[PDB]
Amino acid sequence: AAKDVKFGNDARVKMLRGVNVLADAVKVTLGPKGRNVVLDKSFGAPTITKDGVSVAREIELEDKFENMGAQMVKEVASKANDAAGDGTTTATVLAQAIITEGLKAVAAGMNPMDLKRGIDKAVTAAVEELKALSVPCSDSKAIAQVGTISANSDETVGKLIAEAMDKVGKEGVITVEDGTGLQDELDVVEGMQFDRGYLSPYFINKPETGAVELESPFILLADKKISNIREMLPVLEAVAKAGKPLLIIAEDVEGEALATLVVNTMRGIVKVAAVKAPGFGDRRKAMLQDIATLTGGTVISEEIGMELEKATLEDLGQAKRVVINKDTTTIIDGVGEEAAIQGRVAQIRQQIEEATSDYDREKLQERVAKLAGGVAVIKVGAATEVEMKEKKARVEDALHATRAAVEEGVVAGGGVALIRVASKLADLRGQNEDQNVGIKVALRAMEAPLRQIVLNCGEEPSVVANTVKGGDGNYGYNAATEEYGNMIDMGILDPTKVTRSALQYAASVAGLMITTECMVTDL
């Protein structure tokens, strides 16, 4: 197609207009006084959300150059959501601030590559200062506070996440699902969790979360992969006459002759998904046997000789809920037999008593941790479906932030940590003047989250920013109560990973964005 080509300042102002549209839409949601955004879905009711990445993902502009700017800066929130699950609004605000100040510097006639290098140096130094400024969440013991802050000042959600991490361990697996009542419920049930994903992007359910949910699925287990398709036809026919979705945890499946011909088979009545199995060799068969014992199923094998044609539905496993995601697939509740589960736990405990080699010992301890800890499940309570989606998003953000806090630590929330690390970087210099100006651009942009948090409250961002910069340490401004204090003491804690990731992704995209002289799009 014929291309529209824009050069220099006209292109940059159109790109900034697109970034400004996306970033305003995202930034109205920042902080405790941040408001909600309604996203239109032609497939049903609109979704009300405070999540920055959802608003960012929905944004697309009519103007092609402004749309290019919007997609460029939407990458920031996408990466922030994918890496930490929180801070997408903060990442978008930081990216917009860097883009605005860097374009102001480019309009002042300075080299944007050196501006990008200065921004990169300042952000590397600020990541180091964030690591130094971080406080371990085990020492502080504020998992509930992190979850409360990340759930938009919801003490119930944070306390529930803290209880779940107390039940299954801070390294345990917690899954959020839609509840049935109007109140949030937590149950510690028996289920598995593996870092495995689907082999086909067309297996995604109607939700756009990327993780398909199965209502009482049917588990199929096989450590070997038979070449012929026709031998699998009796099993597929038995599952089709059954009414539980088929999840296959076998040793990697292709869509050349199974998923494609199934796409032409049904129109999407009941979803069937297959995923890999973590590990290999004896370890893979061991965990496959563990899954089969959990769900009451069996594992076929060449040595056993039990062929899939002779397998029945009663021989196969059964579960109550399975969430399949690219990052991690979890089995929420496989019934099986509780006595069988306890016996397998005792047998694997005897195995770890017998085992002595370090790798086998550590994988066996991972197995016993997965079996004993189980899975915590949070059923979100909400009177309606729109409230359900909003609260579930908040609970998922709280879970991600608590995970990031136990993984990497915490810093002062409310944008105070970025203010402190920018104050600590006031003497950082580059190789020339443009690099120094890029450093100053990054350091000024580090104040943007706090300023936007204050602006959402209706207060004056500059006065509060100056008052916070005057203070030292964890001194900042509770926007919920509109008063200053030690942000750790008042429980406004950000994950260190969330802040670091937001800063890094905003910096990378925005520093690349300020270096553009020409933009080429369609007409």
Ligand X SMILES: Nc1ncnc2c1ncn2[C@@H]1O[C@H](COP(=O)(O)OP(=O)(O)OP(=O)(O)O)[C@@H](O)[C@H]1O
Q: What does each C-alpha distance from 184 to 148, 180, 214, 363, 491 come to in angstroms?
A: 14, 9, 21, 34, 22
Per CB under 6 A, 397 contacts ligand X: yes
Out of 58, 86, 290, 408, the residue judged to bind Mg ion by CB under 5 A: 86
Please state, in angstroms and rounded to a whole number, the distance separating the CA atoms of residues 321 and 332. Answer: 5
Per CB under 6 A, 409 contacts ligand X: no
Out of 6, 21, 28, 31, the residue judged to bind ligand X by CB under 6 A: 31
Residues in the chain: 523
Per CB under 5 A, 397 contacts Mg ion: yes
Binds 90: which of ligand X, Mg ion, K ion, none (CB < 5-8 Å by kind): ligand X
Known binding residues for ATP: 29-32, 50, 86-90, 414, 478-480, 494
Footprint on residues 135-154 left by Mg ion (CB under 5 A)? 150
- Closest CB to K ion among residues 51, 184: 51
Binds 492: which of K ion, Mg ion, a second copy, none (CB < 5-8 Å by kind): none
Neighbours of 470 (CB within 10 A): 9
Q: What does each C-alpha distance from 185 to 144, 156, 159, 382 come to in angstroms?
A: 16, 10, 11, 11
Per CB under 6 A, 52 contacts ligand X: yes
Opening angle at CA 392, ends 388 and 395, nearest 5? 145
User: Is the sign of the CA dihedral 317, 322, 327, 328 positive or negative?
Assistant: negative
- Closest CB to a second copy among residues 116, 367: 116
- Closest CB to ligand X among residues 92, 293: 92
Q: Phi and psi at residue 18, in whole multiples of 5°?
A: -65, -45
Per CB under 6 A, 145 contacts ligand X: no
Binds 451: which of ligand X, K ion, Mg ion, none (CB < 5-8 Å by kind): none
Per CB under 6 A, 414 contacts ligand X: yes
300 near 307, Cβ under 8 Å?
yes
What is the per-residue DSSP string for 198-227? BS-GGG--SSTTS-EEEES-EEE-BSS--S
Q: Phi and psi at residue 412, in whole multiples of 5°?
A: -65, 130
Of 346, 468, 454, 323, whose CA–CA distance to 399 is shortest?
323
Per CB under 6 A, 32 contacts ligand X: yes
Residue number, nearest CB to ligand X: 413
Residue number, nearest CB to K ion: 29
Binds 88: which of ligand X, K ion, a second copy, none (CB < 5-8 Å by kind): ligand X
- Closest CB to a second copy among residues 200, 209: 200
| Min separation Cβ 400 and ligand X, Å | 9
- Closest CB to K ion among residues 89, 496: 89
Residues that bind Mg ion (CB under 5 A): 86, 150, 397
